[PDB]
């Protein structure tokens, strides 16, 4: 049986195309079993700890126990075939049904920040909708991505699936990626990555879903539970060392509570920098001459980042915290590091205005800690982000401590929000004229 | 006050950008009032007849009485703000809400086959979802498009809307269209047109909705009500002179009812060509050297077409009918003329196979006449079309004799199905952690 | 196989709705509902629209509103104008009759809302015309006929409404007697309706006695309960808006409506600021114990119950009856009393609004749960704290909960959602609509029409 | 710790009142653990086998193999807390949420035909909705019911549930029932039983749901797959020896295919009686002179029934078939036995009219075998049954080979259809005025 890995992109696409044709002859029960099969692969404790541990060691980014939670989140709260609902309308003209049907072959680009959660997430959703998927993994995570694909192909083969429902290439590269985007038998492109690769898949003449970039602010006003907010903000900021694109990247605190917030942040493992000389070193380490993030510090722990400036702290420190002006490079930039600047503002209305401004119109993600229903409503409505989290860690926006399903492909410019099976399906309308209206 | 027509595409876009930002401050009541303004513009009897006269006069395509019905269908059955529904989940983690929020400025490309209906239905849904729209109409329908835009802007001014919610250019052209595709302030493209213009919009780096092409076959098996099927097939095929994208374009009939079906088709106004010489005359009239459809014949009545080959008939003749092999140009090509080839096949399973094959994987529209629930199920399920109509004219898939709403932007390649306000909105998730779970 | 297909050879003075006997009314409704099953959904929709036109016709709108106040002595013309129009515009139609679909390997399952048959509806003297408009739209949209047993105190306005409905439905080609009543309403006739074998379902909008009775008849019954809606205000509320909303909700139709505020439970640190804004919004505050006692004499019977002589009269009127003259800006009578005061414990249905001062927001919630007497009908809260709004709504478990608005926002007037005037109490249907008056049917197409 | 069994009805109601108050403070996650616990009890292979044969042994009704299927259906396909959905509506006036909330203590009356499945189905749905349940079981299934209640109380005790979530009485009697209906703390009665007990619970001054009686016809017309129809009809009629209240109980066949159907009926396990003397023996055995069914024969097998009249057949015989006029006692009566009268009629429309007539305006369950979508629509629309199955066995209407969920409390007069958790909840509406409209 094929393990799903192919030497060329064209060979993988052609096998996925044959596989999806065979897939159309499978029942919905087969789909459910295949979906459950993919959950069982990642939710198996040894494979969970293998994938989490293996991604840290090969990418050098993130940390092990947080990938346990993300990988389990993907396998547990990704919607299966139940996502493919049916609408019906019956009256004098008959019955109309609206269904979610497969697209065909979907090419899927996966990131080095969430290599396995994206594959688990994309695979389950795309296979639920009746598609086959070709993965072009990130080269920094190519061995952990390939191992997951091989494990999935073994499980699906064991469960009776057509071979090659989930395929990838042996040597991931952007050259294979560009061949995937050009291939006539790829009917849909899904890019989870930075804004360059998303613009690329929206330029190939075919249906594309692209993730978005975000610089998520978290506002805290005087009505918030400060103790809980500090716990949630540390947890959300240091989650997988600030790799997730929903992770908090600057605090905008109302002055009335800012100090007591900083106090409680420190209690939860924030390391506060007050010396501008120490702050200067950290700027020179984590930023280029550009002013933006430096790749070698992305995804690193706070303990690690601090050791590089000669400060030795134990494992209880999870984030590095500093109060700075709004113009500081750490607020304007999307560092993807557990370095959390705090801007002090006079009023909640000022906090909302700055949060909107600092969000750079990404319309991606924003967080607020407030119990005032009017202020929660006002900031949510104005900032207009794909995800908005009130009184919890940012990752509650993905189903970890918040209601709803989870995903690791969050659409930016294409508008689908948190993708699921439904997002990988074509809507069909079936009209039974003057019959089956049995009301 | 501005009338909506700008001299340059740049001026139209930026004015639409200003408008959409003002629009963001309006209530849902204001949207509902503006949506009702657009309906009133097109449903006013004088404008309704003026828009249908001008469209035929200016494009030469379609007929007045049927554009009267299609424009009214766009004004009455296009969804409004009630299309913008809300999802809610509540439990131990609080409340999650999912809303349909505005995109921004939408660039919409409109066809010469359906200029006013596309503008009416694009406008309603895009404005219901809180966007502004820049229209880039087809030059063959410039005068009627701009009048309709100016009428919309006038009525919206009377309603107190932000100026320039609906805009276009004075002299529409392909270069204005390309300027609209390139403009950074256009957040989404919507193209109702041929395969080329849909590939263009999917190659711009933006989100695009593309309403592709079809070759809708109609299968008639031995269990059908043949009398009713003949009436439906003529009515659907000839509706607005075969201009609509769903209109019947070739019959595939089981051999045992084929003759009786033809007799009934003739009974309902199909002119049958038996003489092979006359049939060759028609082929040379309506097909170019490369075998493609002649533009001068698109949307012409059967009376006109037959007159061009020396046959004089009265207004009761609605389509031209001919039995031919499956390889015949009228089968393989999409003609958009009330010319309806018939292909005779041995069994209903042969008919389904040929229908799938001749449809050319457009997965757009198919029609079946059959009272056999298993063959209806099999054909609908196998052919995987965006619209499938059972025992009805093709336009029962547009809300005219079938259950559901109407659209004139039917997305094949991009998978949205029958577009409406939802299709022109971003999806946003709002997570209220550990609160508002009042069950 | 057939060479010509399969044709469909087998597919092919006026009553005013008022009857001298309940049994003739029921029998006429039974025949009507059978004819109705031959009508199309389009017919249902024109008939539903025709009911809306009766009550939203400006003449009839004014006539029904004014006539109900003249006939009953309860309520006021301007608000019944608003309530009748609310029933006319925001009562769901046939769109309420949604279809559930499930498709997969075993085919297609459809779930539809189909007619019960003859419904007998008991309507109250408080909202005679709104309940009749609201029931008739919902019940006919679902494909039923309805027999009305109205209250004798509202006989004329109810018989007139049923007659006007029957005239309009006649003009629309409806089967006669889709909506009927009796010429002489009575408790005798109501009992006869509850007992009649051809009545498939009973819908009662009234007090607990009549709700208990319909649940004792051996047939399907919807019971629309009652309660004593508390309005809780805490220190996070917008007090200037709370006071305005509280005056408006309490004085709506002179505190008749099923949801109207009936006691304020105020957090002490904002209590006096609340009272100050309540008087600014048209509250007459009684502070003199002598005068407060005079009003108790007037509005309470010897048995400690409310005087029906005073139910639904304005605050102007009630103050005039104790020698206090005030102009039309006074909308409610307001007084601060202990939690056991009769005005708190009873349900007066009068624009009389006791305020009880408590210490914390958690005491306000506990008291609101207590004074609601486990009706779990309605409660209101003014508060911006998303935790306290959640705690109160979750704990008090009312059918309707309104946050930071007048109570009547729970019926579609200033709040999202549709309207109704039959709010189910014991039987748990919530805000009744066409769906509530339907049988749920399941049609299973085995291994066909799974076209996904 | 309590085992759930109480000496007096009042003690069980008083215990269940305290339990449900305690249940209110449990979480939705607790309910899900308690619902999964009940599924784990009945789906345990040892308990499943014991529950299915102890029911047969104590009641003398049904058969072992089929109760395995039915208890499996109750445990697997009964909806859980996911049944309690949430409606939201947002706009200028804010947010409105609608939720499904507990009633309190529910008194449930279970039948002798489906004692254990009803207890599994009721308690799962009632506990998902946040209720406790006092069962008042049928006296002849006393010992299997109390065992199930004890096993349930043991599992929940192991899950940390409040004591007495599911309770019953030590000696089931109808006077214990009469205590349950009168107890004021019982906020809702649910009677799964005959027409007397249903009228009773509807005469108590409380909210009541009541099961339905039906005389379910199965029409077969000349368009049906007769091989499959006969196989489905035998399997459906003999399912648990015709005990379920959806089972086929008279065939109304179109004459043109009647003899071919009887042929396939016989091949699938139907023993046809043709001799009128043998037929009269069967009536005296299974009927009284009142006309009513003999309780001694209810739920018995076809082999057992034929044995009493001296006829010896093997276990391949599943039902007893006889062609009779429409007025025959087996047509008019409701035998709940694997006895299947067949009526011959000329036309499918006569079959439909006869089906309607013989159903006795119960509007409960009806079946049709036909491939004509017009005739399936006509019969379904006109007969207005709570369940309607097309082209499958009766039990496909309960989710066994048909789409949808399963129940064993099918409402008759009270209208709720197939009960689930929703049916045991109060609809509450929460209105947030001018806030949380975050669209
Ligand atoms: C809540 C969780 C979520 O929301 S999931 C979405 C999170 N993932 C992302 O946002 C991905 C973007 N992240 C970044 O760009 C970061 O800066 C980091 C992690 C540093 C990226 O590492 P870096 O070493 O700079 O490489 P790169 O990703 O920028 O890519 C460089 C070139 O390779 C390409 N590339 C990217 N991914 C793939 C892929 N899966 N397969 C094939 N090619 C890939 C890029 O397009 C880029 O190409 P080029 O430089 O233009 O030649
Ligand atoms: C019924 C529901 C619906 O979907 S609404 C109708 C949808 N209409 C379609 O799918 C396309 C049907 N029309 C056509 O195919 C052709 O236009 C017809 C009328 C048949 C004849 O083509 P012809 O006479 O040569 O005109 P053309 O469109 O090919 O030439 C225009 C070229 O300019 C471009 N163009 C297309 N639309 C616009 C527009 N609105 N504004 C500016 N430019 C436009 C196109 O690129 C087109 O060139 P090209 O032929 O596509 O290569
Ligand atoms: C599709 C799957 C389904 O629909 S299954 C659920 C549908 N409902 C049923 O199957 C109920 C079965 N309906 C029937 O008519 C049964 O055939 C029989 C056994 C005849 C019911 O009649 P019934 O009088 O109740 O039985 P019986 O002769 O043994 O006498 C019992 C007496 O006790 C009563 N009873 C009934 N259930 C209970 C109970 N759980 N607890 C206490 N009492 C009960 C009965 O009313 C009867 O009393 P009485 O004869 O009226 O004085
Ligand atoms: C409004 C109210 C003041 C009625 O005025 P009233 O004069 O005090 O009450 P009445 O004595 O005239 O009517 C009640 C009696 O008539 C019966 N009754 C109620 N409605 C009836 C009807 N439509 N037809 C016949 N009898 C009816 C009741 O069962 C009751 O009988 P009982 O007192 O012997 O037990 C008040 O008593 C009430 O009934 N409130 C509940 C109504 C309500 O709030 N409906 C919700 C509005 S949407």
Instruction: Judge whether C181 is annotated as a binding position.
Output: no
Q: For a substitution probing ligand 2, which of B194, B241, B243, B249 has the most ligand atoms within 8 Å of its CB? A: B194
* CA closest to D413 among chain C residues: C220
Q: Does B397 share its domain with B411?
A: no
Rounded CA separation D368/D347 (Å)? 14
Q: Does B17 share its domain with B166?
A: yes
Q: Does B236 share its domain with B341?
A: yes
Q: Does C195 share its domain with C313?
A: no
Element holding D239 (H helix, E strand): none
Instruction: Judge whether D59 is annotated as a binding position.
Output: no
Atom of ligand 1 nearest to the CA of A245: 4
Give me A217's structure tokens: 């602010």
Cα B111 to Cα A189, B55, B184, B202, B286, distances in angstroms? 27, 11, 24, 17, 21
Half-sphere exposure of C146 (CA within 13 A, CB side): 29
Q: Does B356 share its domain with B416?
A: no
| Residues in chain C closer than 8 A to D403 (CB atoms) | 102-104, 106-109, 444, 450
Rounded CA separation A56/A59 (Å)? 5
Give me D404's structure tokens: 């949808």
**Residue whose CA lies nearest to ligand 2 atom number 3:** B408
Contact B203 A207 (CB under 8 A): no
Say how many Å lie between the CA of residue B289 and the centre of ligand 2. Answer: 20
Q: Does D363 share its domain with D427?
A: no
Contact A428 B388 (CB under 8 A): yes
Pairing of strands D365-369, D387-390: parallel
- Binding-site residue numbers of B for NADP(+) are 112-113, 138, 140, 194, 211-212, 245, 295, 334, 364, 410
The DSSP line for B109-149 is E--TTSHHHHHHHHHHHHHHTT-EEEEE--GGGHHHHHHHH
Atom of ligand 1 nearest to the CA of A193: 11
Say how many Å lie between the CA of residue A263 and the centre of ligand 4. Answer: 63
Rounded CA separation D51/D36 (Å)? 18
Q: Which of B432, B435, B437, B439 is the mutation pick for testing A, counting most A CBs within 10 A?
A: B432
**Residue whose CA lies nearest to ligand 4 atom number 22:** C151
Say how many Å lie between the CA of residue D238 and the centre of ligand 3. Answer: 20
Contact C2 B225 (CB under 8 A): no
Say how many Å lie between the CA of residue A165 and the centre of ligand 1. Answer: 25
Rounded CA separation A27/C107 (Å)? 11
Ligand nearest to the backbone CA of D296: 3
| Residues in chain A closer than 8 A to D374 (CB atoms) | 435
**Residue whose CA lies nearest to ligand 3 atom number 37:** D138
Q: Which of A377, A388, A438 sits opposite D437 (nearest CB)?
A: A377
| β strands within B39-175, DSSP E | 87-91, 94-102, 105-109, 132-136, 166-169
Say how many Å lie between the CA of residue C206 and the centre of ligand 4. Answer: 6
| Residues in chain B closer than 8 A to C448 (CB atoms) | 373-374, 376-377
Instruction: Identify the CATH number of the domain in which residue C385 sits.
Output: 3.40.309.10
Half-sphere exposure of D79 (CA within 13 A, CB side): 19
Please list the residues that pair with D272 across neighbouring strands: D321
Triad D127, D132, D133: Cα angle to 5°: 100
Ligand nearest to the backbone CA of D9: 3
Residue B344, exposed/middle/buried by CB under 10 A (0-12, 13-18, 19+)?
A: buried
Contact D376 A436 (CB under 8 A): yes
Give me D246's structure tokens: 């959806």
Element holding C112 (H helix, E strand): strand C107-115
Q: Does D107 share its domain with D161?
A: yes
- Nearest residue to A436 via CA among D390, D206, D10: D390
Report the 10 Å Cβ neighbour count for D257: 18
Radius of gyration of chain D (CA): 23
Number of domains in chain B: 2
Q: Which ranges in C142-288 belong to alpha helices (H)?
A: 155-171, 187-195, 208-214, 239-251, 268-280
Rounded CA separation B67/C122 (Å)? 51
Ligand nearest to the backbone CA of C208: 4
Interface of B with C (CB under 8 A): 222-229, 256-257, 259-261, 371, 373-374, 376-377, 380-381, 388, 432, 435-439
Say how many Å lie between the CA of residue B288 and the centre of ligand 2. Answer: 17
Q: Using an 8 Å Cβ cutoff, are C139 and C422 in contact?
A: no
Rounded CA separation A32/A162 (Å)? 14
Ligand nearest to the backbone CA of B60: 2
Contact B386 A428 (CB under 8 A): yes
Place of tokens 């006296």: D139
Q: Which of C2, C8, C387 sits opposite B435 (nearest CB)?
A: C387
Q: Which of B210, B429, B432 sits opposite A387 (nearest CB)?
A: B429
| Residues in chain D closer than 8 A to C448 (CB atoms) | 390-391
Pairing of strands C230-233, C378-382: parallel
Q: Which of A381, A388, A438 sits opposite D380 (nearest CB)?
A: A438
Query: Is any ligand 3 atom within 6 A of the Cβ of residue D394?
Result: no
Cα dihedral sign, B368-B373-B375-B379: positive
Q: Which of B95, B102, B385 sits opposite A403 (nearest CB)?
A: B95
| Residues in chain C closer than 8 A to B256 (CB atoms) | 1-3
Rounded CA separation D435/B139 (Å)? 47
Q: Does A155 share its domain with A290?
A: no
Method: X-ray
Contacts of D280 (CB under 8 A, 6+ apart): none
Query: Is any ligand 1 atom within 6 A of the Cβ of residue A137?
Result: yes
**Residue whose CA lies nearest to ligand 2 atom number 47:** B197
Q: Which of A29, A87, A430 sits opposite C451 (nearest CB)?
A: A430
Q: Does D278 share its domain with D420?
A: no
- Nearest residue to D273 via CA among D320, D312, D234: D320
Q: Does A166 share its domain with A263?
A: no
Q: Does B24 share its domain with B165?
A: yes
Shortest Cα–Cα distance, A435 to chain D (Å): 6
| Residues in chain C closer than 8 A to B439 (CB atoms) | 394
The DSSP line for A203-239 is TSSS-EEEB-----EEEE-TTS-HHHHHHHHHHHHHG
Contacts of D235 (CB under 8 A, 6+ apart): D268, D318, D393
Radius of gyration of chain A (CA): 23
Element holding A2 (H helix, E strand): none
| β strands within B279-377, DSSP E | 319-323, 339-345, 365-369
Say how many Å lie between the CA of residue B195 and the centre of ligand 2. Answer: 9
SS (H, E, C) C408-428: HHHHCCCCCCCCCCCECCCCC
Rounded CA separation D343/D249 (Å)? 11
All partners of chain B with 3 or more CB pairs under 8 angstroms: A, C, D
Ligand nearest to the backbone CA of B194: 2
Rounded CA separation C275/B334 (Å)? 76
Q: Does A310 share its domain with A182?
A: no
Give me D391's structure tokens: 């082209």
Pairing of strands A270-272, A319-323: parallel
Rounded CA separation B209/A239 (Å)? 36
**Residue whose CA lies nearest to ligand 2 atom number 24:** B295
Q: Using an 8 Å Cβ cutoff, are C276 and C325 in contact?
A: no
Residue C305 carries which DSSP code?
P
Contact A433 B402 (CB under 8 A): yes
Atom of ligand 2 nearest to the CA of B177: 42
Rounded CA separation C239/C404 (Å)? 10
Say how many Å lie between the CA of residue B251 and the centre of ligand 3. Answer: 59
Shortest Cα–Cα distance, A57 to chain B (Å): 33
Helix axes B115-128, B45-59, angle to 10 degrees: 130
**Residue whose CA lies nearest to ligand 4 atom number 8:** C308
* CA closest to B26 among chain D residues: D92
**Residue whose CA lies nearest to ligand 3 atom number 16:** D194
For A283, the domain range is: 216-402
Triad D244, D245, D251: Cα angle to 5°: 100
Atom of ligand 1 nearest to the CA of A213: 10
Instruction: Identify the CATH number of the domain in which residue B156 sits.
Output: 3.40.605.10
């Amino acid at each position: 049986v094929s393990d799903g890995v192919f030497e060329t992109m064209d060979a993988a696409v052609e096998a996925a195309a044959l596989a999806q044709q065979q897939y159309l002859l499978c029942s919905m029960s087969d789909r459910a079993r295949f979906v459950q099969g993919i959950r069982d692969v990642i939710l198996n404790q040894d494979t969970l700890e293998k994938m989490s541990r293996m991604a840290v060691e090969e990418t050098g980014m993130g940390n092990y126990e947080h990938k346990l939670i993300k990988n389990r989140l993907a396998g547990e709260k990704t919607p299966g075939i139940e996502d493919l609902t049916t609408d019906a309308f019956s009256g004098d003209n008959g019955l109309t049904l609206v269904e979610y049907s497969p697209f065909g072959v979907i090419g899927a680009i996966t990131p080095t920040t969430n290599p396995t959660e994206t594959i688990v997430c994309n695979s389950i959703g795309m296979l639920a909708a009746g598609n086959s998927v070709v993965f072009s993994p990130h080269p920094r995570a190519r061995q952990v991505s390939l191992l997951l694909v091989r494990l999935i192909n073994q499980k699906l083969a064991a469960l009776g699936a057509p071979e090659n429902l989930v395929v990838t290439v042996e040597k991931p590269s952007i050259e294979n990626t560009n061949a995937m985007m050009a291939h006539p038998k790829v009917r849909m492109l899904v890019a989870t990555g930075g804004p360059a690769i998303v613009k690329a898949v929206l330029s190939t003449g075919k249906k594309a879903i692209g993730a978005g970039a975000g610089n998520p602010p978290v506002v805290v006003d005087e009505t918030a539970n400060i103790e809980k907010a500090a716990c949630d903000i540390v947890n959300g900021c240091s989650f997988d060392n600030n790799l997730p694109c929903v992770a908090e990247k600057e605090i905008i605190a109302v002055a009335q509570i800012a100090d007591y917030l900083i106090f409680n942040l420190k209690k939860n493992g924030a390391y506060e920098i007050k010396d501008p000389a120490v702050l200067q070193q950290l700027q020179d380490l984590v930023l280029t001459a550009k002013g933006g993030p430096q790749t070698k510090c992305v995804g690193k722990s706070a303990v690690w980042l601090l050791s590089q400036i000669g400060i030795s702290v134990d494992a209880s420190i999870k984030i590095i915290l500093m109060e700075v002006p709004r113009e500081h490079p750490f607020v304007q930039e999307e560092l993807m590091m557990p370095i959390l600047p705090l801007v002090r503002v006079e009023t909640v209305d000022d906090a909302i205005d700055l949060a909107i401004e600092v969000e750079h119109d990404n319309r991606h993600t924003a967080i607020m800690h407030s119990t005032d229903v009017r202020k929660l409503t006002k900031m949510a409505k104005l900032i207009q982000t794909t995800i908005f989290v009130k009184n919890g860690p940012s990752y509650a926006g993905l189903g970890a401590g918040g209601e709803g399903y989870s995903t690791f492909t969050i659409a930016g410019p294409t508008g689908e929000g948190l993708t699921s099976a439904k997002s990988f399906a074509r809507r069909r309308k079936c009209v039974m004229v003057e019959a089956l209206n049995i009301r």
